[PDB]
Every structure is written in structure tokens, then in C-alpha cells.
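okkk here we go again. third time trying to get the K8N bound version out, last two times i messed up the smiles copy paste (missing a bracket lol). double checked this time i swear
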Amino acid sequence: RVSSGRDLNCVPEIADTLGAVAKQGFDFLCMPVFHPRFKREFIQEPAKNRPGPQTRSDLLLSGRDWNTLIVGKLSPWIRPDSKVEKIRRNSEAAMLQELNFGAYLGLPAFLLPLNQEDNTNLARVLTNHIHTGHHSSMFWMRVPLVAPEDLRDDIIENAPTTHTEEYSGEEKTWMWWHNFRTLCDYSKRIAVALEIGADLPSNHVIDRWLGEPIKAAILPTSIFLTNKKGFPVLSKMHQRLIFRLLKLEVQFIITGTNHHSEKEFCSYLQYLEYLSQNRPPPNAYELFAKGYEDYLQSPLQPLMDNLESQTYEVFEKDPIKYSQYQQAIYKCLLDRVPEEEKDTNVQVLMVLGAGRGPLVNASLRAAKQADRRIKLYAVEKNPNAVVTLENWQFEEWGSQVTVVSSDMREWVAPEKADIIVSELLGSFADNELSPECLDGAQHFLKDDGVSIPGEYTSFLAPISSSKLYNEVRACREKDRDPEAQFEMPYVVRLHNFHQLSAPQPCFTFSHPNRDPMIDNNRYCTLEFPVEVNTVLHGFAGYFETVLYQDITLSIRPETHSPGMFSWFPILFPIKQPITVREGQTICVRFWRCSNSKKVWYEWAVTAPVCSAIHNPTGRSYTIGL
Ligand SMILES: Nc1nc2cc(CC[C@H]3C[C@@H](n4ccc5c(N)ncnc54)[C@H](O)[C@@H]3O)ccc2cc1Br
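finally!!
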């Protein structure tokens, strides 16, 4: 578990080199598919008629070896962007030739350089290849952290290096890649091979690149320092970066010659191995989530839908959610039933949305550990869950628990309740319609009763991730609006991304809802100070809830209830990405709207430039009442 290749520019025999390279521990080889010095003429006689074979035979390796072990490289003389027409045209033919040969072989990927600012024709020609025949090579755009013009040794007397800081100029290689990928229309098949140099840049520059589709990081031998035993290693600041890329499960490519010419070469790879297993193991959240990184799912809608047995099972595999709930009913029973009243006073607890019982068992445990007495109702509308309750009630609970098979908003109640406990909370707190449901059940709370939870708040934060943007773009479907996928929330363990500003509260709800003419609709404006240049792709959503007094739950990253994996964040995309300059404010507007059938969100960017209103009138996304 750390995937690694060798870069070479020199392969006498593809047979023997591959074997040398396997023996060193490498998983794959980046090599030329034509000789990197064999320039070719397509137009002028007599060179265009150069006889003989143009490159090596495909028969030198097994189909399987081409498809797994080999990554091809563009000849370095191919310059589709030269100022010389004649080179522009040979390079055009050269590139389609190399790209088509990579295709013939079924190479899993082919490497192309971004080594200058104008790669317009290079995009045009790659974009052309991509729309010609059926193939599916990945294209690795080799792009350095630092333009080589910006790490030249300062040794031209009449051409000094820039000794001043240019915040935006030190990011130029990100704009090289941004322009390339924008021109190629964000094709899912164009990724980054990020070249790390001897000196890192400022974190601002490295940060530009998080949220970017990084498939490979290139480590030249020449950036490794030597330790006392004589063996290659990396700076502490290079380590910080490697630890971040291993989180992006990228592939590591080792380019250049052995500069540790005492200590052998698998030494370079071994050090990567040493860093892999010398990192912190996964916490419970991370072991639960490995699989889910940047996987878009539909927000659950347990009102409009009856949930599957196996969903409830994952629900109830959260020890923190439920121990936090137990502790809150504990504290509420003590504050409601003084000691000397302990047997005179039996409190009425109504679990609203009981599912398969976990809040019942959390209510039965609390009442024990406080030594008070409770009448339980278990109100649930999903009759498949009621089969689970009515069986786990005959066999186990008593009399104590009466199962009600009803929508809480419809139920006529035998008694009023001292406490109502609910678990109707979504990733965006109110997105499963806690507010509308508990509003409808509020009439059977005693004039002085408690709701657990008592309060919840959504939070929002602008993010950049060309990765997640591309993922949302791919959810186009037959037979709906071609852009609907941008007008709906996804729940997703956001991973390859950049939070551009601190979360801020969006919508808040309190239970009970004291003040009448209730209205659960809302408009909110948020101003996000942004400190970097970037690209906005959507808004991360999180929440916090007050169950009782100081007992709370959070999926707001800065206050996240540790251990608690029930909820992943939500994501609200925007149709069109929005450039943000350092110092500019991102202004977003959220509406929560409703009729009597549906609830939905609408949303807009008003600064620095306007988006369209997303999801007007729930045309793309609604939550069923
Ligand atoms: N996003 C999440 N949402 C959760 C919701 C729940 C509660 C699901 C229950 C509530 C039931 N429900 C919903 C609306 C409703 C209603 N109006 N009357 C009765 N039962 C109702 C509904 O039928 C169902 O059995 C539990 C765990 C969750 C974990 C996550 Br992560």
C-alpha cells in the first residue's frame, strides 16, 4: 500500500529495463513510445519518406503489460505551440501519432508537459484525440509546483532573479493547468502529474492544487537530502506534503538519475515505504468512510420514503449519537422529577420517528441510570419498522412501551407528553423536515414539556473542488433538464477539496416553537471573506444540534462530535464555477421554501459575480411533506 513508478527517458531494451525496474520494487514504468530524439517530418521531402519502422514493436510485451505496467510520454520535441508554423504542423502530426500509438497499445495513461503559459494548440490537439475512435487512456499533465524559470540559480549578471514576492506570479503553474483543463472542457480523463522541486513554494501555491484532480506526484532524485548512514530522505516540509498526497492515494513517480551513488536505488522507494507506514492509522470516522471519499449520494428522505432494514442498521451503528441521546434524557429526567417525587411521578416520553427502537432503548437506559419512571410511546409511520418494534416489544420491552403505527402529525394522542425525543436530523439539520414534523406533533407536548432535540443550526462554507464539480457534471440523465444535477444537494464525504472560508450559521430551528404564525420558510445572506485566489464549485453544508442544555452533536469540522460517523456533509453545487481573487468576499444567499406538498432550498451567489438562482420553485429538487 503505496503505488510507485519509475520515469526514464532512455530504454535500450523495453524487455530488460522493465525487469530491472520490477526488481527495484516499482509497480510501473513511464517511458517513451518513440525515441525521444527521433524527430519526424510529415510534410517536406525527403525526410517525410524516412523509411524503416518508426518505433519498437507492440509484440515486445504482453497486452497485459502494456495495459498495466507502461505509462507513455510525449516526445519532448513535440511543440504544438511553437511560433514557427512548420514546427506547429509537424508537432500536430507527431502528437496524434504518439497519442494514437498509446491507444493502439492500450496504455493506462500517457504524460504530456505543461512547461509554458500558452498550451492552446496542445489542448486543441488533445481535445481532438479524445473525440476520435473509442479509447480511454488517462492523460497526465506534467506540471511543476514552480516554473523552472522561477528556480533558476541566480547566475545571469544582467538577468537577476526576482527577489520581491509576487503572490499571484508564484501561482502561475496552477493557471497553466487551469487554462489547459478549461479549454479541454474539464474532461474526466485529464489529470495532474504534479512535479515537486528542490525548494517548495509558500503554502498558498501548494494550496492552489488541493481540490485538483492529482493522480501522480513526481519526485526528482535531486530533492532528497542525505542522512548520516548515507541514505536518501526528505526535508520536514517535503514530508508534510507527501503525507497529504498519500491521503489523495496518488501514485509516486521517481524521475532522474541515482545521486546516492554509494547507497543503491530502491533506497528512494524504501523511504516512501518508510513514510507510508510511519503516518497515523485511520480513526473510527476514517475506517467507516474509506470507500466514500467524494462519492455523491442522494440525501435520504425518510418522510417521503420508507427506509430499508439495512439503512436503519447502519443508523444504529453509531455509539456516540445514542450515548449522547441517553445522557440528554438522563439530565432532563433529573431536572423534571425531584428525588422526593421519584415514585409519585412517572414521566410521559414519546419517541417521534422510532425507526427500529434505538431511541426507545436509549430512553429505557436513561430512566434506569437516573432512577425515574416513564411511560414510552414509539410513534413510527414506516410499517416495515413497526414490524421490528412490535416484535421487540412483545419479546422484550413491556406494557412500558406502546408502539403507535402513525405519522406523528396525524396521531390523536391518549395523553400529553412530558418529553418528545426525535432523530429526524439530516446532514443539513432541517433537510429531512424535522421542523414540519415536530411542528405537527407539538400539540401533544405538555404546555411545559421538553423536546430533545431543543435546537439545531445548519452551517455553510464555500469550497473549491474541480474533482466534485466534474462528479456532479457526470450525473446528467436521459429525460430531465440537462443541468438538474447542479440544482440539487448531494451528501458526500468531501475529501479532495479546499474550504475557502470558515463555516457560518445558515438556518436555525427551536422546539417547541413558542410564537405562532410559525413560518419555517427562510432567507439568509452570508458573506465569506476569502484569503486566496481560487475557484468556487459549491457550498459544504454541516449542522450542530442542542439535544439538552450542554449535550450536543456536531458535524461542523471545527467542533465535530469525535467518533460520530452517522452523517457526512452535504454539498450544494453551482452550475458555473466562479473565479475568486484573494481579498474578495463570496456572497451566497439561501432560501428555505415550502408549499403544503413539498419543501426545498433555492440558492444564489451574488458576489463577486452572480450565479443564476439554483432550483427555482424546486424544479430540480424537492423534499416530500
Ligand atoms: N440523515 C439521517 N437521518 C436519520 C433519520 C432517522 C429517523 C428516521 C425515521 C423517522 C421516521 N419519520 C419521519 C417522518 C415521520 C413522521 N411524520 N411521522 C412518523 N415517523 C416519521 C421515518 O419513517 C424513519 O423511520 C434516524 C437516523 C438517521 C440517520 C441519518 Br445519517
